[PDB]
């Protein structure tokens, strides 16, 4: 059901917090990614849709110091740039 | 609103 292939920085990200494989569903990459953040306490404690990726792997792949979960389209766009679909 | 839910809004 089209499985996707993370590119090397996102696969590294995914592996770091458990993941075992090279190919995934979108669901799966989204659960592992959400896991990575919450796990890396990259989220802002008072307005927790904000995420910081300065001096982190996450900014290496997204190219920005921070971002807002609300920005659904912008965030999907960045994830896809990191997948062969 | 939790990060959890905002991200659960992002998927869904």
Residue numbers in the entry:
A (entry chain A): 25 to 109
B (entry chain B): 1 to 12
Give the published text:
Here we report a novel peptide stapling strategy based on the dithiocarbamate chemistry linking the side chains of residues Lys(i) and Cys(i + 4) of unprotected peptides and apply it to a series of dodecameric peptide antagonists of the p53-inhibitory oncogenic proteins MDM2 and MDMX. In this proof-of-concept study, we firstly used PMI – a potent dodecameric peptide antagonist of MDM2 and MDMX that, despite its high affinity for both proteins, fails to activate p53 and kill p53+/+ tumor cells due presumably to its inability to traverse the cell membrane and susceptibility to proteolytic degradation. Previous structural and functional studies of PMI (TSFAEYWNLLSP) identified Phe3, Trp7 and Leu10 as the most critical residues for MDM2/MDMX binding. Crystallographic studies of peptide–MDM2/MDMX complexes structurally validated the chemoselectivity of the dithiocarbamate staple bridging Lys and Cys at (i, i + 4) positions.
Whereas all 12 residues could be built into each PMI(8,12)-a peptide complexed with MDM2, PMI(4,8)-a was fully defined in only 3 copies of the MDMX complex with no density observed for Ser11 and/or Pro12. Alignment analysis of the PMI(8,12)-a conformation also indicated noticeable variability among the 12 copies of peptide, as evidenced by the root-mean-square deviation (RMSD) between the main-chain atoms in the range of 0.48–1.35 Å. In both complexes, however, the crystallographic density for all atoms of the crosslink formed between Lys(i) and Cys(i + 4) unambiguously defined the geometry of the DTC staple. The DTC staple rigidified, at positions (8,12), the C-terminus of PMI in a helical conformation and extended, at positions (4,8), the C-terminal helix of PMI from Leu9 to Ser11. The rigidity of PMI(8,12)-a or PMI(4,8)-a increased to such an extent that the local buried surface area (BSA) slightly decreased as compared with the BSA contributed by PMI to its interface with MDM2/MDMX. We deduced the DTC structure of the predominant epimer from the crystal structures of PMI(4,8)-a and PMI(8,12)-a in respective complex with MDMX and MDM2, where Cys8 or Cys12 remained as an l-amino acid residue as shown in the electron density maps. We used HPLC and ESI-MS to evaluate the proteolytic stability of PMI(8,12)-a versus PMI-0 at 100 μM in cell culture medium in the presence of 25 μg ml–1 cathepsin G – an intracellular protease with dual specificities for both basic and bulky hydrophobic residues. As shown in Fig. S9,† while PMI-0 was fully degraded by the enzyme within 30 min of co-incubation at room temperature, the DTC-stapled peptide was substantially more stable with a half-life of ∼8 h under identical conditions.
